Design an enzyme around this catalytic site. Structure first.
Site, PDB file in Angstrom:
ATOM      1  N   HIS A 327      37.107   6.759  76.055  1.00 21.22           N
ATOM      2  CA  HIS A 327      38.546   6.666  75.836  1.00 21.22           C
ATOM      3  C   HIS A 327      38.976   5.205  75.825  1.00 21.22           C
ATOM      4  O   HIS A 327      38.704   4.484  76.794  1.00 21.22           O
ATOM      5  CB  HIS A 327      39.304   7.429  76.918  1.00 21.22           C
ATOM      6  CG  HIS A 327      40.780   7.512  76.675  1.00 21.22           C
ATOM      7  ND1 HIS A 327      41.317   8.009  75.507  1.00 21.22           N
ATOM      8  CD2 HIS A 327      41.831   7.151  77.449  1.00 21.22           C
ATOM      9  CE1 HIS A 327      42.635   7.955  75.573  1.00 21.22           C
ATOM     10  NE2 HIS A 327      42.973   7.439  76.741  1.00 21.22           N
ATOM     11  N   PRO A 328      39.625   4.724  74.765  1.00 16.61           N
ATOM     12  CA  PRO A 328      40.029   3.309  74.720  1.00 16.61           C
ATOM     13  C   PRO A 328      41.017   2.991  75.832  1.00 16.61           C
ATOM     14  O   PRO A 328      42.095   3.584  75.919  1.00 16.61           O
ATOM     15  CB  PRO A 328      40.665   3.168  73.332  1.00 16.61           C
ATOM     16  CG  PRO A 328      40.086   4.291  72.530  1.00 16.61           C
ATOM     17  CD  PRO A 328      39.911   5.421  73.500  1.00 16.61           C
ATOM     18  N   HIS A 356      45.978  -2.945  69.947  1.00 14.53           N
ATOM     19  CA  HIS A 356      46.828  -2.289  70.936  1.00 14.53           C
ATOM     20  C   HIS A 356      46.305  -2.522  72.348  1.00 14.53           C
ATOM     21  O   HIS A 356      47.069  -2.875  73.254  1.00 14.53           O
ATOM     22  CB  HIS A 356      46.921  -0.791  70.637  1.00 14.53           C
ATOM     23  CG  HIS A 356      47.630  -0.004  71.697  1.00 14.53           C
ATOM     24  ND1 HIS A 356      48.983   0.256  71.652  1.00 14.53           N
ATOM     25  CD2 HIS A 356      47.173   0.575  72.833  1.00 14.53           C
ATOM     26  CE1 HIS A 356      49.329   0.962  72.713  1.00 14.53           C
ATOM     27  NE2 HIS A 356      48.250   1.168  73.447  1.00 14.53           N
ATOM     28  N   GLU A 357      45.000  -2.327  72.554  1.00 16.51           N
ATOM     29  CA  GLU A 357      44.428  -2.488  73.887  1.00 16.51           C
ATOM     30  C   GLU A 357      44.438  -3.947  74.328  1.00 16.51           C
ATOM     31  O   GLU A 357      44.702  -4.244  75.499  1.00 16.51           O
ATOM     32  CB  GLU A 357      43.008  -1.923  73.919  1.00 16.51           C
ATOM     33  CG  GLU A 357      42.921  -0.443  73.576  1.00 16.51           C
ATOM     34  CD  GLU A 357      43.671   0.437  74.562  1.00 16.51           C
ATOM     35  OE1 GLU A 357      43.801   0.043  75.741  1.00 16.51           O
ATOM     36  OE2 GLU A 357      44.132   1.524  74.156  1.00 16.51           O
ATOM     37  N   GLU A 384      53.194   0.625  76.339  1.00 11.63           N
ATOM     38  CA  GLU A 384      52.855   1.260  75.070  1.00 11.63           C
ATOM     39  C   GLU A 384      53.624   0.650  73.904  1.00 11.63           C
ATOM     40  O   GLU A 384      53.128   0.651  72.771  1.00 11.63           O
ATOM     41  CB  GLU A 384      53.121   2.763  75.152  1.00 11.63           C
ATOM     42  CG  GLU A 384      52.215   3.500  76.122  1.00 11.63           C
ATOM     43  CD  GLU A 384      50.778   3.559  75.644  1.00 11.63           C
ATOM     44  OE1 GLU A 384      50.553   3.969  74.485  1.00 11.63           O
ATOM     45  OE2 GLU A 384      49.874   3.193  76.425  1.00 11.63           O
ATOM     46  N   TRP A 459      59.808  28.336  76.226  1.00 13.32           N
ATOM     47  CA  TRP A 459      59.025  27.261  75.624  1.00 13.32           C
ATOM     48  C   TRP A 459      59.050  27.350  74.102  1.00 13.32           C
ATOM     49  O   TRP A 459      59.303  26.353  73.416  1.00 13.32           O
ATOM     50  CB  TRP A 459      57.589  27.314  76.148  1.00 13.32           C
ATOM     51  CG  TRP A 459      56.620  26.457  75.390  1.00 13.32           C
ATOM     52  CD1 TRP A 459      55.752  26.864  74.418  1.00 13.32           C
ATOM     53  CD2 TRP A 459      56.408  25.050  75.551  1.00 13.32           C
ATOM     54  NE1 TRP A 459      55.019  25.796  73.959  1.00 13.32           N
ATOM     55  CE2 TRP A 459      55.403  24.671  74.640  1.00 13.32           C
ATOM     56  CE3 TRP A 459      56.974  24.073  76.375  1.00 13.32           C
ATOM     57  CZ2 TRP A 459      54.951  23.359  74.530  1.00 13.32           C
ATOM     58  CZ3 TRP A 459      56.525  22.771  76.265  1.00 13.32           C
ATOM     59  CH2 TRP A 459      55.524  22.426  75.349  1.00 13.32           C
ATOM     60  N   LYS A 463      60.729  25.381  70.867  1.00  9.94           N
ATOM     61  CA  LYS A 463      59.902  24.950  69.744  1.00  9.94           C
ATOM     62  C   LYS A 463      60.591  25.242  68.418  1.00  9.94           C
ATOM     63  O   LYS A 463      60.551  24.422  67.493  1.00  9.94           O
ATOM     64  CB  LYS A 463      58.541  25.644  69.798  1.00  9.94           C
ATOM     65  CG  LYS A 463      57.549  25.049  70.784  1.00  9.94           C
ATOM     66  CD  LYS A 463      56.929  23.765  70.262  1.00  9.94           C
ATOM     67  CE  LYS A 463      55.718  23.374  71.096  1.00  9.94           C
ATOM     68  NZ  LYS A 463      55.125  22.081  70.663  1.00  9.94           N
ATOM     69  N   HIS A 487      48.470  15.699  78.882  1.00 11.87           N
ATOM     70  CA  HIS A 487      49.412  15.088  79.814  1.00 11.87           C
ATOM     71  C   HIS A 487      50.045  16.118  80.739  1.00 11.87           C
ATOM     72  O   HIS A 487      50.428  15.787  81.867  1.00 11.87           O
ATOM     73  CB  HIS A 487      50.496  14.334  79.043  1.00 11.87           C
ATOM     74  CG  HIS A 487      49.961  13.303  78.097  1.00 11.87           C
ATOM     75  ND1 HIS A 487      49.310  13.632  76.927  1.00 11.87           N
ATOM     76  CD2 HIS A 487      49.986  11.950  78.146  1.00 11.87           C
ATOM     77  CE1 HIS A 487      48.954  12.526  76.298  1.00 11.87           C
ATOM     78  NE2 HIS A 487      49.353  11.492  77.016  1.00 11.87           N
ATOM     79  N   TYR A 497      56.551   8.298  76.154  1.00 10.77           N
ATOM     80  CA  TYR A 497      56.249   8.155  74.737  1.00 10.77           C
ATOM     81  C   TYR A 497      57.495   8.225  73.868  1.00 10.77           C
ATOM     82  O   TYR A 497      57.483   7.704  72.747  1.00 10.77           O
ATOM     83  CB  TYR A 497      55.237   9.217  74.306  1.00 10.77           C
ATOM     84  CG  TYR A 497      53.936   9.132  75.071  1.00 10.77           C
ATOM     85  CD1 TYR A 497      53.071   8.062  74.884  1.00 10.77           C
ATOM     86  CD2 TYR A 497      53.576  10.115  75.982  1.00 10.77           C
ATOM     87  CE1 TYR A 497      51.883   7.974  75.582  1.00 10.77           C
ATOM     88  CE2 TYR A 497      52.389  10.036  76.684  1.00 10.77           C
ATOM     89  CZ  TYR A 497      51.546   8.963  76.480  1.00 10.77           C
ATOM     90  OH  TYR A 497      50.362   8.879  77.175  1.00 10.77           O
TER      91      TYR A 497
HETATM   92 CL   LIG Z   1      52.191  24.258  72.169  1.00 10.06          CL
HETATM   93 ZN   LIG Z   2      47.601   1.724  75.302  1.00  7.27          ZN
END
Ligand SMILES: [Cl-]
Ligand SMILES: [Zn+2]
Ligand SMILES: *[C@@H]1O[C@H](CO)[C@@H](O[C@@H]2O[C@H](CO)[C@@H](O[C@@H]3O[C@H](CO)[C@@H](O)[C@H](O)[C@@H]3O)[C@H](O)[C@H]2NC(C)=O)[C@H](O)[C@H]1NC(C)=O
Ligand SMILES: *[C@@H]1O[C@H](CO)[C@@H](O[C@@H]2O[C@H](CO)[C@@H](O[C@@H]3O[C@H](CO)[C@@H](O)[C@H](O)[C@@H]3O)[C@H](O)[C@H]2NC(C)=O)[C@H](O)[C@H]1NC(C)=O
Ligand SMILES: *[C@@H]1O[C@H](CO)[C@@H](O[C@@H]2O[C@H](CO)[C@@H](O)[C@H](O)[C@H]2NC(C)=O)[C@H](O)[C@H]1NC(C)=O
Ligand SMILES: *[C@@H]1O[C@H](CO)[C@@H](O)[C@H](O)[C@H]1NC(C)=O
Ligand SMILES: *[C@@H]1O[C@H](CO)[C@@H](O)[C@H](O)[C@H]1NC(C)=O
Ligand SMILES: *[C@@H]1O[C@H](CO)[C@@H](O)[C@H](O)[C@H]1NC(C)=O
EC number: 3.4.17.23
Lengths: 596, 192
Positions: A327-328, A356-357, A384, A459, A463, A487, A497
């Site tokens: 995973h980066p 990005h990293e 981020e 939920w 949606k 997450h 995000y």
């Molecule tokens: Cl879903």
């Molecule tokens: Zn990142």
């Protein structure tokens, strides 16, 4: 001595005591993520348990200072972080059960596999097996299988655990003077103490919902266009007025619509700005990619990567003889140590991700002079955003050509720049309704507004209403489709995000103005711009010592987030979308479902 | 007789809180071994030129030596107000000499963590110039007494560097030699 005087010398003793223990815990966890063995998995816990035991020891030792008696906000900031009773405010059997279900959920998610009923000897897990299906497959029933299997196999295993995960985490927040666990998560944006810059945990909900309505015009028009293109790929499957099936969106959950570019490209006739083969023709390796990224940050006034970075980072997979976590990640172990963990291949996506990293490390390098408790981003969404504005400038065609990856005769028409913006929209704007609807559901579950008899019902109602996405098969309350996302089952907040997506364009618009860029905001490259570099460096070095209302205002001049820069980025694409959707229905019906 | 500058090539350097000083009396000085060498990371002089020092005479020379962090070498200068300058080793404002430092990560930093090199983190009042404190008394930060025991607002004054080879340059061990030149009234270190 004053209570403030006693607290300053306490933090001085803590910062030097914590920095040494944190380094041993970080280096031990590095030797595990780069060399998964049995000695290193125990050294990670041995050095990790000693840090947590030291932190709880310093928690009560910090609580001996009345927070109201301190006037210096910098020390007042660090005391409140240490005095957070955290998850230790639970009894031992509740804290040990909470740590168990948090590990069990993280286990059956990473190790959960589904088997093909047609070929039972071929079983696949999420990465890379199931993710490859949702990313590339064009068979409705094949995508329907992988989508439903992931939520019926490992999703149901997480349902009884997530119910206990909510009630245990709620008691943790209510004990720490919060309303619910959602109120606990929203405290990351809270600002209390600075006159004119205060910010409450409820102001976050008000600010994201008021700005989300201003995004609906752009998302609805993209949703209508994508629906029209998806109808041609799945005829007699998608109603021209209904929502989109969740398994036809490009990944396991529809979080990003990037993989829909092959079906939604405006002008597929134009040449593809995919320089993966071009990177190979120049005999590039992972070192060349990161050495080129190092050259990028230096051109704007930032320093080289540290000498230890090039010595200790893992830029390639060390082979099959030594397996690692690919995973980066950008590691900030403290004590001047900065590393990047990434199994880089010679492709274009790893090229942009390398910027990005490395942006995260430039952020980590800047606030290294701050005290230990203040070495972090302004809020959870600042890191981020800083990493994305690096790949934003590194993805423009003029930057890709000037590096040597694209031929210097690429005609930047209004068709190649609209294909580029459509690819950017499938990722950047496609995840905004997905992120809010997820956090809004998690916010209500912690507040008890969504009872257990309609956890999955409410939920998928959201949606359809919020995101405009319908489930392909009906799900009862046995499923736990939110937990089928990483997450959610790994106890990570998700509103970070949403904010970073808006922050990165406020940052980009400010730096490009200082970079003397003239064209559209989506054609900007802040390379060679020391004016924009010093303007941004004033923000990264700030860390968490100043509130995010000031840190955001220091660069762009605003005490809060703004949706205007995001709309300006996709404004040339917005008008092209409205032209397509004149003879197509804009909007979705919340009552259509691919079944009866 | 040759002056014994070969303090520099000593095997063990002392901690900064308990630095050591050597008096250099009647001897001929070999300053040429220094200004023809890029072996140091600093080599910063004060009050005297680096090359005019060859043909100069002083009453006697004092060589202070210790070990400090990479980011703490900047505090080995006149008019510095850091933790090292205030609580470990203070230079006078009228300092006349040269400070020298060279990276010694491979010999003073182990993977397990070299904790021998210590420094003083808490001290009542700043150190006078060229003063030295070795007392390990439990520093009392509050108003209640510390009875020789550590606890709340009663911290041990000495903190140790965790010198390790994987640290950044700013946290690697640097050996420091602070050459000071004294001039009183009597004639002993020359090189005309
Ligand atoms: Cl879903
Ligand atoms: Zn990142
Ligand atoms: C709240 O407390 C913090 C920490 O005690 C204060 O920051 C500190 O402010 C002092 C000046 O009052 C800084 O001293 C300076 O140190 C530099 C070191 O290079 C030196 O060159 C200067 O001559 C001066 O002595 C100190 O560095 C600084 N600490 C940090 C970590 O930055 C802050 O001022 C306090 N708030 C208020 C309103 O007083
Ligand atoms: C501003 O950023 C641009 C973006 O890369 C920099 O342009 C590129 O600069 C490199 C070297 O500085 C050029 O490499 C040279 O290419 C020529 C090709 O004929 C070659 O003969 C030279 O030996 C050298 O390898 C590169 O060509 C150039 N990009 C383009 C499209 O011309 C620019 O240097 C930056 N400005 C600065 C650093 O002042
Ligand atoms: C992978 O981890 C091991 C420890 O889990 C590293 O260290 C080895 O430890 C054993 C046990 O004492 C020694 O006998 C070996 O000599 C150590 N080294 C090696 C290469 O086996 C090991 O170094 C790690 N691998 C890498 C590539 O760093
Ligand atoms: C933490 O919890 C303890 C008891 O569990 C309590 O005495 C203390 O006041 C709490 N501290 C804070 C900051 O809530
Ligand atoms: C970065 O490293 C390269 C290595 O060749 C060097 O040429 C350049 O001057 C360095 N720049 C900075 C700012 O350290
Ligand atoms: C220390 O020894 C090295 C070689 O071993 C020599 O080059 C250097 O001049 C010596 N330093 C002094 C002060 O004599």
């Amino acid at each position: 001595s004053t209570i403030e005087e006693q607290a300053k010398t306490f933090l001085d003793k803590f910062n030097h005591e914590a920095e040494d223990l944190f380094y041993q815990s970080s280096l031990a966890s590095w030797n595990y993520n780069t060399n998964i063995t049995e000695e290193n998995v125990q050294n990670m816990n041995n050095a990790g348990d000693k840090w947590s035991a030291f932190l709880k020891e310093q928690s009560t030792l910090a609580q001996m200072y009345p927070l109201q008696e301190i006037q210096n906000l910098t020390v007042k900031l660090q005391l409140q972080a240490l005095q957070q009773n955290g998850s230790s405010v639970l009894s031992e059997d509740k804290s040990k059960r909470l740590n168990t279900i948090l590990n069990t959920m993280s286990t059956i998610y990473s190790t959960g596999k589904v088997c093909n009923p047609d070929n039972p000897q071929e079983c696949l897990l999420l990465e890379p097996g199931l993710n490859e299906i949702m990313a590339n497959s064009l068979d409705y029933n094949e995508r329907l299988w992988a989508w439903e299997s992931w939520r019926s196999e490992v999703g149901k295993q997480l349902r009884p655990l997530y119910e206990e995960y909510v009630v245990l985490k709620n008691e943790m927040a209510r004990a720490n003077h919060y309303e619910d666990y959602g109120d606990y998560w929203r405290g990351d944006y809270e600002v209390n103490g600075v006159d004119g810059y205060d910010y409450s945990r409820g102001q976050l909900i008000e600010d994201v919902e008021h700005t989300f309505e201003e995004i609906k015009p752009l998302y609805e028009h993209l949703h209508a266009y994508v629906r029209a293109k998806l109808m041609n790929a799945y005829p007699s499957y998608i109603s021209p007025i209904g929502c989109l099936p969740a398994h036809l969106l490009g990944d396991m959950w529809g979080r990003f619509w990037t993989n829909l570019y092959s079906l939604t490209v405006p002008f597929g006739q134009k040449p593809n700005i995919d320089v993966t083969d071009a990177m190979v023709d120049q005999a590039w390796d992972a070192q060349r990619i990161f050495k080129e990224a190092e050259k990028f940050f230096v051109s704007v006034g930032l320093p080289n990567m540290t000498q230890g970075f090039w010595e200790n980072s893992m830029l390639t997979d060390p082979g099959n003889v030594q397996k690692a976590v690919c995973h980066p990640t950008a590691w900030d172990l403290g004590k001047g140590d900065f590393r990047i963990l990434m199994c880089t291949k010679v492709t274009m996506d790893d090229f942009l991700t390398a910027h990005h990293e490395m942006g995260h490390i430039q952020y980590d390098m800047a606030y290294a002079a701050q005290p230990f408790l203040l070495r972090n981003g302004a809020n959870e969404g600042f890191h981020e955003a800083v990493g994305e504005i690096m790949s934003l400038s590194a993805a423009t065609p003029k930057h890709l050509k000037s590096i040597g990856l694209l031929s210097p005769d690429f005609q930047e028409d209004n068709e190649t720049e609209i294909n580029f913006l459509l690819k950017q929209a499938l990722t950047i704007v496609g995840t905004l309704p997905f992120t809010y609807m997820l956090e809004k559901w998690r916010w209500m579950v912690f507040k008890g507004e969504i009872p257990k008899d309609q956890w999955m019902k409410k939920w998928w109602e959201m949606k359809r209403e919020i995101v405009g996405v319908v489930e392909p098969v009906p799900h009862d309350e046995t499923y736990c489709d939110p937990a089928s996302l990483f997450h959610v089952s790994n106890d990570y907040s998700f509103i970070r995000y949403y904010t970073r997506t808006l922050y990165q364009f406020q940052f980009q618009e400010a730096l490009c103005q200082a970079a003397k860029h003239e064209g559209p905001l989506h054609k900007c490259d802040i390379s060679n711009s020391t004016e924009a570099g010093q303007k941004l460096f004033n923000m990264l070095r700030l860390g968490k010592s100043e509130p995010w209302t000031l840190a955001l205002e220091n660069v762009v001049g605003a005490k809060n987030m703004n949706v205007r820069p995001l709309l300006n980025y996709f404004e040339p694409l917005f008008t092209w979308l409205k032209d397509q959707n004149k003879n197509s229905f804009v909007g979705w019906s919340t009552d259509w479902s691919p079944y009866a | 007789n040759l002056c014994p500058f070969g303090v520099f090539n000593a095997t063990k350097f002392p901690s900064v809180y308990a630095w050591e000083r050597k008096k250099i009396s009647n001897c001929v000085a070999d300053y040429s071994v220094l200004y023809n060498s890029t072996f140091f990371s600093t080599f910063k002089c004060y009050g005297v030129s680096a090359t005019k020092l060859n043909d100069l005479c002083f009453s006697n020379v004092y060589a202070d030596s210790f070990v400090v962090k990479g980011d703490d070498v900047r505090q080995i200068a006149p008019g510095q107000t850091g933790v090292i300058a205030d609580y470990n080793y203070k230079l006078p404002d009228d300092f006349m000499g040269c400070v020298l430092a060279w990276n010694t990560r491979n010999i003073d930093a182990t993977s397990t963590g070299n904790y021998n090199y210590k420094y003083r983190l808490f001290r009542k009042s700043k150190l006078k110039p060229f003063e030295r404190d070795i007392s390990t008394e439990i520093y009392q930060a509050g108003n209640k007494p510390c009875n020789g025991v550590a606890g709340p607002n009663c911290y041990s004054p000495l903190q140790s560097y965790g010198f390790r080879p994987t640290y950044g340059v700013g946290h690697q061990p640097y050996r420091v030699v602070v050459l000071s030149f004294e001039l009183l009234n009597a004639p002993t270190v020359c090189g005309p």
